[PDB]
Each structure stands twice: as structure tokens, then as C-alpha cells.
From Swiss-Prot:
UniProt cross-references to PANTHER family, sorted A to Z: SHIKIMATE KINASE, SHIKIMATE KINASE 1, CHLOROPLASTIC
Quaternary state and interactors: Monomer.
Family: Belongs to the shikimate kinase family.
Gene coding for it: aroK
GO molecular function annotations of the record: ATP binding; magnesium ion binding; shikimate kinase activity
Protein name per UniProt: Shikimate kinase
Coiled coil: none
Pathway the protein contributes to: Metabolic intermediate biosynthesis; chorismate biosynthesis; chorismate from D-erythrose 4-phosphate and phosphoenolpyruvate: step 5/7
Amino acid sequence: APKAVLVGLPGSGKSTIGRRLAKALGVGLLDTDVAIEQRTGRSIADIFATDGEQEFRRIEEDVVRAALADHDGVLSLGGGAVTSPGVRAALAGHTVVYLEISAAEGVRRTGGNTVRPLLAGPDRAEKYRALMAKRAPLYRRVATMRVDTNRRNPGAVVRHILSRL
Ligand SMILES: Nc1ncnc2c1ncn2[C@@H]1O[C@H](COP(=O)(O)OP(=O)(O)O)[C@@H](O)[C@H]1O
Ligand SMILES: O=C(O)C1C=C(O)[C@@H](O)[C@H](O)C1
Ligand SMILES: [Cl-]
Ligand SMILES: [Cl-]
Ligand SMILES: [Mg+2]
């Protein structure tokens, strides 16, 4: 079981806080997206391209179940994983840190468009708020710890999580 499972919208800091929290804890980081494309040689985006969310999520939920079981480090859940009820069920009892980010800051951190398909450019701010409106309640469902990453620099979010694990 992971030291901590990180959930949040794109830009909330999963990959970042994950890497830093993993390092701090001396443990490894496991990003389910990477765990997904590695295990498939075919990229997340391109995966969707060929088989769509219905399939992606099936693959994703299965890697998550796996990571939740065999990973003792820090696990960063790909943003939409929470939408799969089986991902939510798999999460129960685990240490789930919901990295909270406002839509304004969130739209801005992901400003570079470092992938994030559902977050395509044409009217991203609107897109991100809708996305936040939909995923937000779910992250709050599965979260055992909510961390506001809005003001806090990465180090402080990480120390905040450490201080609380
Ligand atoms: N607390 C933070 N303060 C400032 N920038 C952050 C913070 N958390 C993450 N970032 C930055 O925002 C960008 C998105 O972070 P990332 O970890 O890739 O998000 P996610 O994987 O959750 O989608 C990264 O450049 C990262 O450096
Ligand atoms: O918020 C989301 O649905 C997504 C979050 C990331 O994990 C991407 O890899 C997924 O493809 C999409
Ligand atoms: Cl299981
Ligand atoms: Cl994501
Ligand atoms: Mg990520």
C-alpha cells in the first residue's frame, strides 16, 4: 500500500509533489499514466485515440489496483482515474491526498499543455472549470487528506503532507 496516493486535477501537482514527496520519503514514485503507457508501449493520448476512455479507464483502473497493491511508495493517480467507481473502491482505506488547486491557478500551471488531452487549448479556462466541477466532488470522496496547493510552494505542500502522513 502506498505511503500516499495523490489525486487532483491537472496542474494540482501530482507529478511534482509526487516526485518530491517520493524523494523526501526515500521511496519511489509511481504515476499510473506512466505505468499505463509503459505497460502498453502506446501513449495515454494515442491510447484514447485508438480505443477511447471506455478502454483507457479499463486499463487505467487495472494498473491502479496493481499500484495500490504492490506500491509502497508515492502513487500519483492520473487525473480521471477517480471517475471509475472501481478506482474509488480500490482507494478505500488508503492514504489519499487531494491536492486542491483553484481553476485560475490550475489553468495557469498546465499553461504549457504538457499533454492533458481533456484539457485541449480552445477555451481551456472554461474547460478546466467544468472539469473541476465534475472531478472535484470525487476527489473529495476518495480523499483522506485535502491539501490546498494554491499559495503553498511545492516544498510546503510536500512538508505539509510529510507532517501528516
Ligand atoms: N504548489 C505548486 N506551486 C507552484 N507550482 C506548482 C505547484 N505544484 C505543481 N506546480 C507546477 O505546476 C505544473 C503542473 O504540475 P504537475 O505536477 O505536472 O501536475 P499534475 O501531474 O498534477 O497534472 C508543474 O510545472 C509544476 O512545477
Ligand atoms: O483528468 C483526466 O481525465 C486525465 C488525467 C490524466 O491521467 C491523463 O493521463 C488522462 O488521459 C486524462
Ligand atoms: Cl484489489
Ligand atoms: Cl492528469
Ligand atoms: Mg501527472
